[PDB]
Design a protein around this ligand. Structure first.
Ligand SMILES: C[C@H](CO)OC[C@@H](C)OC[C@@H](C)OC[C@@H](C)OC[C@@H](C)OC[C@H](C)OC[C@@H](C)O
Ligand SMILES: C[C@H](CO)OC[C@@H](C)OC[C@@H](C)OC[C@@H](C)OC[C@@H](C)OC[C@H](C)OC[C@@H](C)O
Ligand SMILES: C[C@H](CO)OC[C@@H](C)OC[C@@H](C)OC[C@@H](C)OC[C@@H](C)OC[C@H](C)OC[C@@H](C)O
Ligand SMILES: CCCCCCCCO[C@@H]1O[C@H](CO)[C@@H](O)[C@H](O)[C@H]1O
Length: 711
């Protein structure tokens, strides 16, 4: 029987082997792991994968929000999937309706189509089970954190089950003033034909959120900060601001809703062959107003020369966006023999429509904020739509075919090919006659404030991708393997935006080529102690090509190159029946290989990427009633991107966070759980923005008390 900390196989029918026999760097985080840790959203689940987190805080005119995940050196937020279907949206994803999260490092275009040059994150949705039972949870923790979840599964006939998951969460922020979050979700589903050759699964998901967003705090007093001028020199001695200070306003808010409907048909043609057809409709809506602060010399106001009277200036960051996907996917898996060669085939076709609409809003002006005594109890405004919108649409037709050839009992080959036909359409417009960062002058005879179109173009293309691997069983517990994969991101694949062809430095020029990523991997996997403990180690290199760089004249072309190289170590499962573990270590050297350096200190490293990262979680059943857990994470130092701001830190220091846990079983119906996070109340930078004026502080020590009920 498999370990609860080491799921043996991916739920995705595109992966024809268990994790231990998959020639990929694959980590599966189970619901048991997430539950034992008290992790309630994707970001906190991903802390079980080293060097994966929200490391970029944004620029000056925008901020990152939600699951802005960085992995293998780049933003991977557009390659988060639900049940293998892309889920774009700068919102945080609750884990209440999720069975496991599958993280594959090293991109492959065969898996899910276009992607970031990093890998893939896949949340697996709960489905109705064959048993009947009720699980309920109630949590109270630091800063009046309150959470309730309910999971109900009921079998009805010989062949029908229904499942319902419900979540409610309300909290302030233990480390931040005025930041509060609130969300509610419901996920009901019904399954027909269980235990039969013909199955229907119907799913629905709704999540509503109302958060107070957080733009960060000034970087005064951090390692590397210097006052930007002689005239502001008191900022070299006035110290770090209180990490609780809120620099936003009482008008700052972040709203979203998620609505997703899925319908899955399954038909067993025989005991070896199954056809599947999945249809999903999904919409994620979000609008927010949040505060970005700036601290350059010309941003600083000095009423009194006492630094307590000084102000930084505020910039509004607004978003009013809608992301929709409609898709239909057919999958066929079959196992059969051609002579002595055994085949496990997985082939399919996908139709997809993806749309993004960014609704223009009126500019919001914010007053200066006191550096050490921010007054946030003011109501500057809210969002008013102005009719100047950006519309993106991408239509995709994809056909794929994978095969894992069993050549002998000890030697396996695997390959895959995928073809994507896409058409992308993009147009944008701005309100004319403004004075800000993207203001466009009104043309003749057009009323001031009218939507003027700045881009309206389209792009059609092909994406041909493939992968190939080889695996050898050294024993019945250990193998070795190599793997090579190609992945691409065409113009308009990152965020639907396109640029007019012929000029500019945008990777989205319709005349440019896709950014191509080629990954190589050599590793070994060992299933130890009765196949209950999985140990892995791999060497990898990703070469990224067609990056936009500038020619000797003004021209731009695609001669740039980037590279991420290193090794990966993972462990997962049971060391003894009483002792569970999960964790990993990575070393990844992300660097510019051709082109301008992008790191502030002028070296070749990529920003917002730690070079060393370590995570380890362990849980031990000390007695029949009492269990104990512990966790430790190390994130290394990283570089800020280059910006013209003067005196702001060019890098951030690595940090250690430790966690602990306690579990007490009262009876089969009731058990308690005490999680405490950042055990040593360590201070650190969790992310820095591009210019370097603001950062997100690391959360302080927090507690979380949970009551688990089962019926
Ligand atoms: C609570 C049940 C448990 O089976 O499930 C609730 C969930 C299924 O629906 C909750 C949602 C509809 O509303 C969210 C809000 C009420 O916050 C949750 C919290 C207050 O719950 C009790 C929480 C122990 O706080 C109360 C206080 C005593 O700590
Ligand atoms: C016990 C619990 C009650 O709490 O559950 C009740 C149960 C009885 O109902 C759950 C189920 C019915 O919900 C899913 C439903 C919303 O189906 C979606 C389907 C219509 O997708 C269409 C598809 C994507 O859209 C395109 C298609 C039309 O081509
Ligand atoms: C409802 C369903 C989802 O449930 O979706 C509706 C559907 C509309 O989705 C789109 C699908 C039909 O895609 C095919 C086509 C629209 O894509 C353009 C492609 C053919 O052009 C590239 C072409 C090779 O490039 C030519 C190049 C040489 O210039
Ligand atoms: C039984 C296991 C629980 C261990 C509790 C450790 C609590 C540590 O306590 C913390 O220690 C830090 C040491 O760096 C100090 O800097 C903090 O001020 C102190 O609060």
């Amino acid at each position: 029987t498999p370990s609860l900390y080491a799921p043996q196989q991916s739920a995705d029918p595109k992966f024809s082997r268990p994790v231990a026999d998959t020639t990929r760097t694959m980590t599966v985080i189970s619901e048991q792991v997430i539950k034992d840790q008290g992790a309630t959203n994707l970001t906190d689940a991903l802390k079980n994968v080293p060097g994966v987190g929200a490391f970029f805080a944004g620029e000056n005119g925008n901020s990152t929000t939600g699951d802005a995940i960085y992995m293998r050196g780049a933003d991977t937020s557009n390659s988060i999937y639900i049940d293998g279907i892309r889920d774009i949206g700068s919102v945080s994803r609750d884990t209440f309706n999720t069975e496991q999260v599958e993280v594959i490092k090293g991109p492959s275009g065969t898996d899910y189509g276009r992607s970031a040059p990093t890998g893939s994150i896949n949340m697996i949705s709960k489905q109705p089970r064959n048993d009947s039972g009720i699980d309920a949870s109630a949590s109270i923790g630091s800063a009046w954190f309150r959470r309730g979840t309910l999971d109900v599964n009921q079998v009805i006939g010989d062949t029908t089950a229904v499942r319902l998951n419900v979540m409610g969460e309300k909290t302030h922020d233990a480390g931040r003033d005025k930041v509060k979050n609130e969300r509610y979700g419901v996920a009901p589903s019904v399954a027909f034909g269980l235990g039969t050759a013909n199955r229907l699964y119907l799913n629905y998901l709704h999540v509503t959120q109302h958060n107070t967003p957080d733009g960060g705090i000034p970087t005064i007093g951090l390692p590397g900060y210097s006052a930007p001028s002689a005239g502001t020199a008191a900022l070299n001695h006035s110290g770090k601001v209180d990490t609780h200070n809120f620099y936003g306003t009482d008008s700052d808010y972040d709203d979203s809703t998620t609505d997703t409907a899925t319908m899955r048909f399954e038909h067993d043609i025989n005991d070896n062959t199954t056809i599947r057809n999945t249809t999903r409709w999904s919409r994620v809506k979000q609008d927010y107003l949040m505060t970005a602060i700036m601290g350059g010399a010309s941003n600083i106001t000095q009423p009194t020369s006492d630094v307590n009277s000084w102000t930084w200036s505020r910039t509004a960051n607004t978003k009013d966006v809608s992301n929709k996907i409609l898709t239909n996917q057919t999958n066929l898996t079959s196992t059969f023999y051609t002579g002595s060669i055994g085949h496990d085939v997985s082939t399919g076709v996908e139709f997809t429509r993806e749309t993004q609409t960014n609704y223009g809003v009126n500019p919001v002006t914010l007053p200066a904020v006191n550096i050490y005594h921010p007054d946030s109890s003011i109501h500057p405004g809210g969002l008013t739509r102005n009719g100047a919108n950006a519309n993106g649409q991408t239509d995709t037709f994809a056909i794929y075919a994978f095969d894992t050839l069993q050549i002998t009992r000890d030697f396996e080959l695997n390959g895959g090919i995928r073809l994507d036909n896409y058409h992308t359409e993009y147009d944008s417009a701005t309100a004319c006659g403004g004075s800000g960062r993207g203001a466009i002058t009104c043309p003749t005879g057009v009323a001031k404030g009218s939507p003027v179109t700045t881009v309206d173009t389209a792009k059609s293309g092909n994406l041909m991708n493939w992968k190939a691997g080889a695996l050898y069983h050294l024993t019945e517990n250990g193998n070795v393997y190599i793997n090579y994969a190609v992945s691409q991101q065409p113009p308009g694949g990152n965020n639907f935006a396109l640029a007019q062809s012929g000029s500019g430095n945008s990777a989205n020029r319709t005349d440019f080529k896709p950014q191509k990523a080629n990954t190589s991997e050599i590793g070994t996997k060992w299933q130890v102690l009765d196949k209950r403990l999985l140990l892995t180690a791999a060497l990898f290199r990703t070469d990224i090509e067609n990056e936009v760089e500038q020619n000797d004249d003004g021209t731009y072309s695609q001669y740039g190159k980037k590279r991420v190289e290193g090794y990966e170590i993972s462990v997962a499962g049971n060391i003894t029946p009483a002792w569970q573990v999960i964790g990993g270590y990575t070393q990844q050297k992300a660097t510019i290989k051709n082109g301008k350096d992008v790191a502030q200190d002028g070296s070749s490293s990529l920003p917002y990427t730690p070079e060393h990262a370590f995570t380890l979680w362990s849980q031990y059943q000390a007695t029949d009633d009492i269990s104990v857990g512990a966790g430790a994470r190390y994130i290394g130092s990283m570089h800020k991107g280059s910006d013209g701001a003067v005196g702001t830190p060019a890098f951030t220091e690595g940090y250690w966070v430790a966690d602990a846990k306690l579990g007490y079983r009262v009876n089969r119906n009731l058990d308690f759980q005490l999680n405490v996070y950042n055990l040593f109340d360590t201070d650190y930078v969790a992310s820095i923005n591009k210019s370097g004026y603001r950062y997100h502080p690391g959360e302080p020590r927090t507690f979380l008390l949970t009551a688990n009920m089962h019926f």
